[PDB]
Every structure is written in C-alpha cells, then in structure tokens.
C-alpha cells in the first residue's frame, strides 16, 4: 500500500511511499483516508503525517487535472482538500513530518497541521501560476491561516519558493530539523502534544480556525466553479 | 501589608508598577489597584503609560485557585475585570508600552498584548498555558492574541500551549523589541518618552482605526463571559 | 524642464521612474503622469510594470502644502487621486515590482505596498509618519497597510508612526527584498522579467483572490475620502 499506519500508546504515524514522489490522486487518498480511519479507531493522542525519502508530496497527479473527463478531476481536487480540511479540524494535535519538498497540493497539506517540522533544504511551492494555474478558494484560504500577510501574497500570486529559515519565517514551517531527523522529531513533538489536554486543545484549536475552516468548507463545496 | 500597584508620573509619562510580592497575580485587589492607578494617569493627563511587572515576572496571570474552584460568580467576574482591563489598554488615549520585567502566563500574556509597545528580555518566558492545564482560552483572550500575533504563532500559542522568549518571542509578535533584564524598564521610559511626542490626537484615532473591530470582538467575548463557564 | 515621470519599456517588461527633481511628492501633476505612464504601460501590454522613484527617495508622500491649507476640494481631489493609484497597482494584472529607490514617507510607503515585490536598500526609512506630525491615516491607507504587514508590525507603524529600515521593514512586510543601493533599480528589472514568465492570466486571477476583500475596503475608503475630512 502507498499508506503505512502504526500507533502506540501515545501517536499515530501515517506515512506516505508510492515509491514516487507521493501525488495525492485517489489511491493516495484513499490510503490516507483509511489510514486516517484507523488513527480514529485508535483514538490516538497525536497523529504524525509523513512523506517518504524524496519528497513530502508533489501535489495532485498532473495528468488527471490537465486531460480527460472533469469528473475525476473534480474528485481528485475535492478529496485533496477534504483531507486538509479533516486536519486542520482533527481533535488531536496533528503533526507534519515534511520530509522532503513540498509542493502544491503537498504545501497545503503541509499548512493543514499544528505543528510542522522540515530540513533546510527541502523547497515548499504553490507552483500553481507558474504553471497556468489559478489557485482554487479553498487551497487560498489554507495558506492565508497560517502565512504572515507579505508571504501569503507571494506564495499565491508569485509561486514563490521557501525553504528553512524563510519558510519558517513565512508561516510555512515551525521547526527546522536535520533529514535524517525530521520523522522522529515530529514523533517527539507528538508525544510532547499529546500530553496537552485533548478536550481544550480541540475546542481552542477549532477557535483559532472557525472562519478559515468555514470558508475552506464553501471553497470544496464550490469546486466545481473552479472548473467553470 | 501595601498596595500592589505603584503609581509615578512626571510632565511626560506615568509608570504603574505591579508588585504584589508575589507572581502579580490578577487578582480582584490587582485589579482595582491598577484600574485606580490608570484613573489616575487620566486625571494627570500623562502623555504615555508604562505597565511593568516586578522582579520575578510581569504577571503570572488570573488566581487559579479562584478559577478552578468554589462559586462561578468570584470566577466570572475576575475574568471579566481582567478582560476589560485588556479592553481598557488597547483602547487608551494615550501610547501605552509594557515593561515586561519577567514572565507572561495566560491574562499575564493578554495584558503584555495590550499596549502599544512590549519590551522584555531573553529570558523570560510568555505563554498561553490554557490548553495545557485543561482550560479552553477565551475568545476575549482569543481576539488578543490574533491581533498581535503572526498567524502561524497564533496557532500554536493558542492550541499547542507553545512558551515563547526573546527572539522568538519578537518573531511571533508576542513582543516589539529586546533589551537586557537591567534596562527593561528604563527602555520602556525611554520609548514612553518618545511615544509622548506624537500627536496625541492623531494616535488614539489612528489606533482606534487599528483596534475596531478587534476591540468590538473583545467586547462581544467580556459580555459572553458567562458563556466560557457554562452561563 | 520635463515631466516628472520617465516611461521606458522593452518587449518583455514596463519601467516608470520617478523625478521631479525633489522628494516626489504625489501631487497632482505627479499623479497625473503616474497614471499618463501606466496608461502606456496597458497600451503596450507589458508582460511585467517596475515602478521606481528617483536618487533621494522612493517618493515622501502627499503634497503636505495642498494638504494642510486652502480648499478643501484639492486636497480631497489629491487623496482620492493617490489612493485611486494604489487600487490601481494593487489590482495590476501584470506583476508590479517596486523599486524603492531611497526612504518611502506616508503616501510613499502606502504606495510601495501597493506592488507585488518590493525591492529597497538598507539605510531607506519606510514609514507611515502621519502620527507624528498630526495626521490620522485615511482608511483605505490602513487597508493597505494592513494587507501587507505583519499583525504587530501593522499596529506599530500605523499608530506609532514607526520607521522601518532594511531587516526590520523585510520582516515587518514593507519591503520582499533587499539589494544595495545601486542595483535597486537593476534587481527590480531582472526580478520584473522573471515574473514576467509566469503564467500572467493564473497571476491576475490569483491575486485577485488574494486581495479582493483588501480592494473591496480600498474602494469605501476612497467612496468615504470627504469624511477624512468633516
């Protein structure tokens, strides 16, 4: 499977290995989804999303989103930022172990946890208008919660890329970790958060995300205008 | 056995320092001693305010002893004295800067937010542990943190409970500007001062063009005060 | 003598410069060939738009002596005009880079947040210093300023007049960059020229959504501009 799902007492880790560069088409969903289900059965303290040894994630698959019928596109797009959405409202701490680059899709799901660690090296991208396309409602209102309000209007209108320091100063990134570490240090951060308290840190987060959340809802319901 | 708050003023500035011996805890006597010290800084019409702490912190925060335990009405009244002395900070004709003298835990970091310019050194710590001791934060104290914090800091000093000092503390907005422990406070005299010097008129409209909404939000979140307990 | 704005432009990218031999300021006459060299800029469909000012400042703001005596109908003209400018650039659809090419005073530093990449010096003060000298920020300045800064930033700098130079403007959100003094003006070109290569309908489109709610307030601070002033 493309999804890897393993607990114990305090966190769950789901990580991501197509053997590729991770794109977040409907397998790759699905897999998350089922792996998210389990962490839910669970009832983990904490969960850590993670990417494989190449990249965090390179985004949606390019060839459904550019040729052939819009309905699997229009999945394909939906199902992406259902995830984000299922994050940024998890009840639990969730974080994101950006293990490699991050781009597109991948950066929105990478802004969809609490807290997220990545090396120096690894560059984050909504690539977007330096491809063609126009950044959908729902991925605009992702980055405009956690970018501070210069980054966010060159991430979206100019493709910018960050990296390190300048993705952590950005809002993109909250921990700068050697490679070889950032898994485990995102594990150890998850055990630190899972010994918040998980009753107040579901109400409080979902305080802090009330309106962003609301307007990520309308931009999935919305999809469709996103097409045309 | 004294007050807990000292009052001194020149031509320029006034200076209210809190020193209840303790951690300058938010108390019900804390707060009546330093919604009397304000009243007087508006009688002697001051041309800046400075709020610092004591040796130990800036303020530790609201009594949790009041707050987890006994009679909702000691609990919700505190919290709503406090948030309207956030309220009351934020809305100040004149410019206010926060001498942070040492640590800022929970209303100890909603009022460090309140002023118009934050001073604190390397080491102290300022931190919203609401979540990590079971409590959910306020939206008066919500509204607090999102208009000075950047929006990534403003989730983790929110949800995660996340302690910031110093540089980390500047990055996040928790503060304005680093200065040793020794000269926090003649630092904070020293930008009053400075402060004093800008038209006075023009700065309590401007940062009230700054603050509306944020100010109508805590409003709206110290009338729902009974709310945050269950009514 | 000249105009106060010099337009030049090639196949890929648009450059309007600045000088009216003094600190810029952004009276009529300025305006008027601000918007006279835009209007070229849109009949030459340039990919990219750098706007720089000249060897002193980027620009010091308002003509203070329309401002402060006489009718009031020039000077209500002169606001409504200077933020007509911002709306303008902020809702470019071609990139706008800034060259800011010395200190950013008041309608300077609004109006260097009215870009898409801005690109100053180190030792180039940026400041909204209305507070210090008497003057309450008109709204849809705030809302410029606002899009731009960071929460802490925007409080200090609107309501305490705050100066930003170098780091401290990059991490406020005044400036995006930092070059030496003399490559200002050639950065904000080969930057221009990069930005040029994006996929200019995905940019107008994007930035759009980016700012649509900020323009929506420019447009009732400039609709409200007579009540800035009784």
Do not use: W
């Amino acid at each position: 499977g493309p999804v890897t799902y393993t607990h114990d007492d305090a966190i769950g880790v789901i990580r991501m290995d197509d053997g590729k560069v991770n794109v977040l088409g409907p397998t790759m969903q699905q897999a998350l989804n089922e792996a998210i289900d389990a962490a839910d059965r669970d009832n983990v303290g904490a969960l850590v999303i993670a990417g494989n040894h190449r990249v965090f994630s390179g985004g949606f698959d390019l060839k459904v989103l550019t040729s052939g019928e819009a309905k699997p596109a229009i999945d394909m797009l939906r199902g992406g930022f259902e995830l984000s959405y299922r994050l940024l409202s998890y009840p639990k701490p969730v974080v994101i172990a950006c293990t490699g680059h991050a781009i597109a899709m991948g950066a929105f799901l990478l802004c969809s946890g609490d807290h997220r660690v990545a090396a120096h090296a690894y560059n984050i991208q909504a690539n977007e208008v330096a491809i063609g396309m126009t950044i959908p409602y729902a991925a605009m209102e992702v980055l405009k919660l956690r970018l501070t309000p210069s980054a966010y209007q060159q991430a979206a209108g100019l493709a910018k890329t960050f990296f390190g320091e300048t993705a952590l100063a950005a809002g993109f990134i909250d921990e700068i970790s050697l490679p070889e570490v950032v898994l485990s240090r995102a594990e150890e951060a998850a055990r630190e958060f899972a010994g918040l308290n998980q009753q107040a840190h579901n109400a409080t987060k979902l305080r802090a995300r009330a309106e962003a959340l609301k307007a990520i809802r309308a931009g999935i319901d919305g999809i469709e205008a996103e097409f045309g």
